[PDB]
Nucleic acid binder design. Structure first.
Lengths: 135, 122, 175, 72
RNA sequence: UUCUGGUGUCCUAGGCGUAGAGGAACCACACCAAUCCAUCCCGAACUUGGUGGUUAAACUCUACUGCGGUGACGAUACUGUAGGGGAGGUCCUGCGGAAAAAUAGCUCGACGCCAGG
RNA sequence: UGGCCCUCGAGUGCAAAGGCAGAAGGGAGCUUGACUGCAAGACCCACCCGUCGAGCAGGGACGAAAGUCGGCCUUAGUGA
């Protein structure tokens, strides 16, 4: 649930994944889609390894769309005790992937080719994913 | 295209003031002049109603020249006196000074002064 | 002459050319702001006084003392310094002054074409400009700093642009 | 005192014409050929490009057309 | 009853845009301006004395549902209390309350005191 | 400079929140309550302490007048 961002004064608290309330999108772009079931801290090394894989089995075809964006920073403690708050960029950054929201979107292709494409993309995701269609 | 909010004229001429609001509504004195005549009114307060309302034309009925000038300052004091007197007889002098747009010596300088001739004093 | 010509030839044609109706509601000049900016950047009070006492002759009216609007530019200009003047005449003082530029002053200027580009603002308003080589019955090239021009923005009561040039063309303004 | 009399100059206001004898008030060539006028800028001649497109119109007459050598 | 002016109770079902239309009985433009007064530059705006013309603009109405706004029923989210599950760190159940968004629809206000036709 | 769209998206002495165009915004004249002596009724603290405040008494300033002002938009700029 991340995408290329730009430099800024990014450095705030962590946050807290709440009820499914917020997330609850549908299927706008692309024919089929893929949703989640439980919130989490998706890093950039996960979305990138999942996006390229989505087109890795395609190569020169349709177009990929991302209706998501990270926000909630991620501070980690080196190895010492706890004197203050973490940095926020040691490893990476994440957000919140609550269920009901849409993630990947594929279209302009067949049903089978667009089916296996989401398969591998789902493996890259740490949280379980639900496969849908339309309607 | 895009709705724009602009404060009306009667919202920048410093019409409504503080203090006087000691009462639900201060006994203002509607002393406005049109583009030919002038209308005076001792509007009450609370909700509405007034004590006495006179005009430049109404005076012509009592005793005034027919095709006589109105914008003239001479008529100002005449319009301020006709509205007065009877206004006091209605009960008791309940008029204040309210006017936003007349540089002191405006066509209302005689209207307010006329009130000081019937009893209203401040 | 300029004012009189208005209600005896100017307005008439403005009644037949455009929509037929009453007498008024026709293109009529309201004022004439012949602003004469001064060379900015250079901090000098001489150029300021040389301007105020410059237009106060051709218009016979004490100029203005505009102040630099509060803003952040590239130059080292501050807010609170005077760098321009704009006088505007009305009534008789307007028509009379406007009649000057039309009759006199021009084509007094050597090599005066007259062909004006597009221009127009978009609401019945017209403006012109004079190079650093003009001439006016009031201006005296005997006791002045340096030859400097000025801007002349004439606004009318016209609703549209097509009703702007139609008021200055039949008036006498060079076109 | 220069600030005393603001100088109205009403004379030049109402009487803009006055006397053309003093200063030429549009007596010269406001907009007309001066003398000889021999100016040929880029805006003259080059602007109004005289179109020159001539072709062969079909006529009613017996004439053999075609060069000695044929070529596409 | 219709129209018009000043001041309120109510402040974007009452706002904005567009089109049409009315009055020199009322209101605005407008005429004049040596003055009281004003414009650090112009009486543009205030202001003062007032033929004529107009009511185009402005303003006050009417029509027209583009743009705003007002706003159900049902469902959903959340939650108090009393309990039960549970690997995503939340969720479910009995019960009470139950909006935001969105949909049908409503809608381009309605009146009060006084004065002048 | 002139015209149009001109709608806290500007300006507030300085951080920031809130608030403000009936303006403390901005400009000018007169002035200078950036008043003395008190002060019903309350807020804020364990206490000390802090804050707001109609009106009254003795005298002034501004406006025609009603009328305002006991500091500076408010909250720090301090210490028995």
């Amino acid at each position: 649930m991340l995408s290329p961002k730009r430099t800024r004064f990014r450095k705030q608290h962590r946050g807290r994944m709440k009820g499914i309330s917020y997330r609850g999108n549908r299927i706008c772009f692309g024919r089929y889609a893929l949703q989640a079931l439980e919130p989490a801290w998706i890093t950039s090394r996960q979305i990138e390894a999942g996006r390229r894989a989505m087109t890795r089995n395609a190569r020169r075809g349709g177009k990929i769309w991302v209706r998501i964006f990270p926000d909630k920073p991620v501070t980690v403690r080196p190895a010492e005790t706890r004197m203050g708050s973490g940095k926020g960029s040691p490893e990476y950054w994440v957000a919140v992937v609550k269920p009901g929201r849409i993630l990947y979107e594929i279209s302009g292709v067949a049903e089978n080719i667009a089916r296996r494409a989401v398969a591998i993309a789902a493996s890259k995701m740490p949280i379980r994913t639900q496969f849908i269609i339309s309607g | 295209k895009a709705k724009t909010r602009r404060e009306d004229r009667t919202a920048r001429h410093v019409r409504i003031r503080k203090k006087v609001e000691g009462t639900p509504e201060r006994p203002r004195l509607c002393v406005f002049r049109s583009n030919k005549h002038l209308y005076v009114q001792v509007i009450d307060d609370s909700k509405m109603h007034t004590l006495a309302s006179a005009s430049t034309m109404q005076k012509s009925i009592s005793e005034e020249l027919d095709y006589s000038s109105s914008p003239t300052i001479e008529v100002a004091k005449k319009v301020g006196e006709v509205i007065a007197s009877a206004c006091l007889e209605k009960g008791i002098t309940k008029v204040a000074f309210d006017r936003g747009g007349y540089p002191y010596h405006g066509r209302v300088k005689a209207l307010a002064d006329a009130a000081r001739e019937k009893g209203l004093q401040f | 002459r300029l004012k009189t010509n208005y209600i005896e030839k100017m307005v008439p044609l403005l009644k037949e050319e455009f929509s037929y109706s009453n007498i008024l509601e026709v293109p009529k000049v309201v004022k004439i702001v012949v602003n004469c900016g001064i060379g900015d950047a250079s901090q000098n009070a001489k150029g300021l006084d040389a301007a105020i006492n410059e237009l106060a002759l051709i218009t016979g009216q004490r100029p203005v003392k505009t102040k630099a609007k509060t803003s952040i530019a590239g130059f080292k200009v501050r807010e609170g310094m005077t760098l321009g003047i704009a006088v505007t005449l009305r009534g008789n003082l307007m028509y009379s002054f406007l009649d000057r530029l039309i009759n006199l002053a021009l084509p007094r200027t050597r090599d005066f074409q007259g062909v004006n580009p597009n221009s127009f603002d978009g609401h019945g308003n017209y403006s012109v400009g004079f190079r650093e080589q003009s001439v006016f019955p009031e201006i005296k090239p005997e006791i002045v700093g340096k030859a400097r021009g000025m801007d002349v923005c004439i606004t009318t009561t016209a609703k549209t642009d097509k009703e702007a040039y139609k008021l200055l063309s039949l008036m006498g303004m060079p076109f | 005192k220069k600030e005393l009399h603001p100088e109205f100059h009403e004379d030049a206001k109402v009487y803009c014409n006055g006397e053309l004898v003093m200063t030429t008030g549009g007596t010269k060539k406001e907009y007309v050929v001066d003398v000889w006028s021999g100016n040929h800028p880029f805006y003259l001649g080059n602007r109004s490009a005289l179109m020159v497109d001539a072709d062969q119109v079909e006529k009613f007459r017996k004439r053999f057309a075609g060069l000695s050598e044929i070529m596409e």
